[PDB]
Design a protein around this ligand. Structure first.
Ligand SMILES: *[C@@H]1O[C@H](CO)[C@@H](O[C@@H]2O[C@H](CO)[C@@H](O)[C@H](O)[C@H]2NC(C)=O)[C@H](O)[C@H]1NC(C)=O
Ligand SMILES: *[C@@H]1O[C@H](CO)[C@@H](O[C@@H]2O[C@H](CO)[C@@H](O)[C@H](O)[C@H]2NC(C)=O)[C@H](O)[C@H]1NC(C)=O
Ligand SMILES: *[C@@H]1O[C@H](CO)[C@@H](O)[C@H](O)[C@H]1NC(C)=O
Ligand SMILES: *[C@@H]1O[C@H](CO)[C@@H](O)[C@H](O)[C@H]1NC(C)=O
Ligand SMILES: *[C@@H]1O[C@H](CO)[C@@H](O)[C@H](O)[C@H]1NC(C)=O
Ligand SMILES: *[C@@H]1O[C@H](CO)[C@@H](O)[C@H](O)[C@H]1NC(C)=O
Ligand SMILES: *[C@@H]1O[C@H](CO)[C@@H](O)[C@H](O)[C@H]1NC(C)=O
Lengths: 49, 454
């Protein structure tokens, strides 16, 4: 996948977290991308390996 | 007046959600418990970002204006709000030095070359910063001299302008019918994130030992113990450069001053050894009708040095000094003394009319004016054979078409400037391969004690 710059690989899944309405993606402790927001529909999706 | 922030001017360093995670950042922040100006207005600086709060149920604060000159001849930003809505704008303006029915806007008087447009109690905080041609604006919205509390500021805008900024102002709505300014520095903070992802508390890793400990542990609660937090290193001041003497000063007072100089055709070459050279005695010596350095700097002579320096001497006529120079032609710079085209020394010459000239003639200063081939750079010839101009052998006797090549100046005291005898001393500098050679003297940095530095 590529989300307007974020390049990665994995399974995408519907989320149930709530970003603040200016945050694009979420990170874990140890700093790995684990959630994104879809630019077009603006919904949060988790990224599992 | 001045006031004290308590914990104010915290903004989300960027996107990316986040929850309970005492996350540590390095950025430009407003340090805790700072000295914020108070205003009840003038041109301020920018220098690195700005915190800016305000308060009033009416709306007296009606935007800011930014830039370097706040006029034409350079570009600036303008952010305004009439009773309608915000108006960002980027042109070259002409701003009132004091810019500010319900009729208004005596702000500027020019709107040229616009490169960006846009149109459309209370405490209102703003953080303005300007990095890589982007002008970022964070802002808040908390309603009730500042008070005391924590409230993180959320990003608002992003403008890819490119504009330079060094100054800014404010805009107010007059009467016809309170604000602060902090500055931002590079600090390191420890932000506590809620489970919804909002910043609820922070620690200024650079305040009191407790905050430096919280920063070192990356937490907001330290349990009892003892923690190594940093290091203490005394600071050294000044740099004392010690060295050895050098006594032996340049024997320049033996070449400039000898009782007699040599003639041009056979000049004297006195080569200088490895010592210390003091040019302060020649630079402040005398009138010096001519003193032109070509390679080395005449005003900074005391800062360079080279392997060996050479000093020549002769006595040439008055109007011929202009031929002792790189790339000249004449009876002097072709047969007697030629300077190369990559010369590096300094040529100097002063008048000596009252010493080397006697009445009834002084025939002891010669100059050769007949040579078969022009001289190569820095060669000296002392031959006195008869120059033969024609086709008939003369076997070494004066006569017709065979002339003697050595002739003498008729130096006399009743001459005009341009025929009186001038003395010349040409210096040359050279660095072949030697590491430590003749060099100028400096200042023996005094040696201090009981004080570390350098
Ligand atoms: C990007 O464009 C798409 C369409 O190209 C937008 O999708 C629309 O979303 C709304 C939901 O509010 C639907 O009612 C429309 O029917 C959708 N249009 C189509 C063609 O499917 C999408 O919303 C746009 N992105 C954003 C952030 O608004
Ligand atoms: C070159 O030699 C002359 C003397 O021939 C020096 O002149 C002396 O200058 C000092 C200082 O002014 C006087 O005390 C002496 O009396 C002078 N000598 C005479 C004979 O009067 C001159 O100083 C020398 N040049 C240098 C650079 O030392
Ligand atoms: C802020 O700095 C000024 C500079 O002179 C000083 O007079 C003033 O006392 C300072 N204010 C505080 C709160 O330290
Ligand atoms: C508010 O100011 C902007 C600045 O140019 C202007 O364009 C706008 O027309 C103003 N509002 C009204 C109602 O005129
Ligand atoms: C900016 O305005 C001045 C005066 O109106 C003009 O001379 C100049 O050409 C303008 N800049 C550009 C890039 O055209
Ligand atoms: C801003 O001003 C500095 C002055 O030191 C200048 O060197 C720099 O080029 C300016 N910025 C831009 C984008 O030209
Ligand atoms: C926000 O946080 C509060 C307290 O941390 C929590 O009770 C609430 O469920 C969260 N989500 C909201 C308000 O949408």
């Amino acid at each position: 996948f590529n989300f307007n710059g974020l390049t990665g690989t994995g399974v995408l899944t519907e989320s149930n977290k709530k970003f603040l309405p200016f945050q694009q993606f979420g990170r874990d402790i140890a700093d790995t991308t684990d959630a994104v927001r879809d630019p077009q529909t603006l919904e949060i999706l988790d990224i599992t390996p | 007046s001045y006031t004290n922030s308590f914990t104010r001017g915290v903004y989300y360093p960027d996107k990316v959600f986040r929850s309970s995670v005492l996350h540590s950042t390095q950025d430009l922040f407003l340090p805790f418990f700072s000295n914020v100006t108070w205003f009840h207005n003038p041109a301020l600086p920018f220098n690195d970002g700005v915190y800016f709060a305000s308060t009033e149920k009416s709306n007296i604060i009606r935007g800011w204006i930014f830039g370097t000159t706040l006029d034409s001849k350079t570009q600036s930003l303008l952010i305004v709000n009439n009773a309608t809505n915000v108006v960002i704008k980027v042109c070259e303006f002409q701003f009132c030095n004091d810019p500010f029915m319900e009729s208004e806007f005596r702000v500027y008087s020019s709107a040229n070359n616009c490169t960006f447009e846009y149109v459309s109690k209370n405490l209102r905080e703003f953080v303005f910063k300007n990095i890589d041609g982007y002008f970022k604006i964070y802002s808040k919205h908390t309603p009730i001299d500042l008070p005391q509390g924590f409230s993180a500021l959320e990003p608002l805008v992003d403008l890819p302008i490119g504009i330079n900024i060094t100054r800014f102002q404010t805009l107010l709505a007059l009467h016809r019918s309170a604000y602060y300014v902090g500055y931002l520095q590079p600090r390191t903070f420890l932000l506590k994130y809620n489970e919804n992802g909002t910043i609820t508390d922070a620690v200024d890793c650079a305040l009191d030992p407790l905050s430096e400990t919280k920063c070192t542990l990356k937490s907001f609660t330290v349990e009892k113990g003892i923690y190594q937090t940093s290091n203490f290193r005394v600071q050294p001041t000044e740099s004392i450069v010690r060295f050895p003497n050098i006594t032996n000063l340049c024997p320049f007072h033996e070449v400039f001053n000898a009782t007699t100089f040599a003639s041009v055709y056979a000049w004297n070459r006195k080569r200088i050894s490895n010592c210390v050279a003091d040019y302060s005695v020649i630079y402040n010596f005398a009138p010096f009708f001519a003193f032109k350095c070509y390679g080395v700097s005449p005003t900074k002579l005391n800062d360079l040095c080279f392997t060996n320096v050479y000093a020549d001497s002769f006595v040439i006529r008055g109007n011929e000094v202009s031929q002792i120079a790189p790339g000249q032609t004449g009876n002097i710079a072709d047969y007697n003394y030629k300077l190369p085209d990559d010369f590096t020394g300094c040529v100097i010459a002063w008048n000596s009319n009252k010493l080397d000239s006697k009445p009834s003639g002084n025939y002891n200063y010669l100059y050769r004016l007949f040579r078969k081939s022009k001289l190569k750079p820095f060669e000296r010839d002392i031959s006195t054979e008869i120059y033969q101009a024609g086709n008939k052998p003369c076997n070494g006797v004066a006569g017709s078409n065979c002339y003697s090549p050595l002739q003498s100046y008729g130096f006399r005291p009743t001459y005009g400037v341009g025929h009186q005898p001038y003395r010349v001393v040409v210096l040359s500098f050279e660095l072949l391969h030697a590491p430590a050679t003749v060099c100028g003297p400096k200042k023996s940095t005094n040696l201090v004690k009981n004080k570390c530095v350098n």
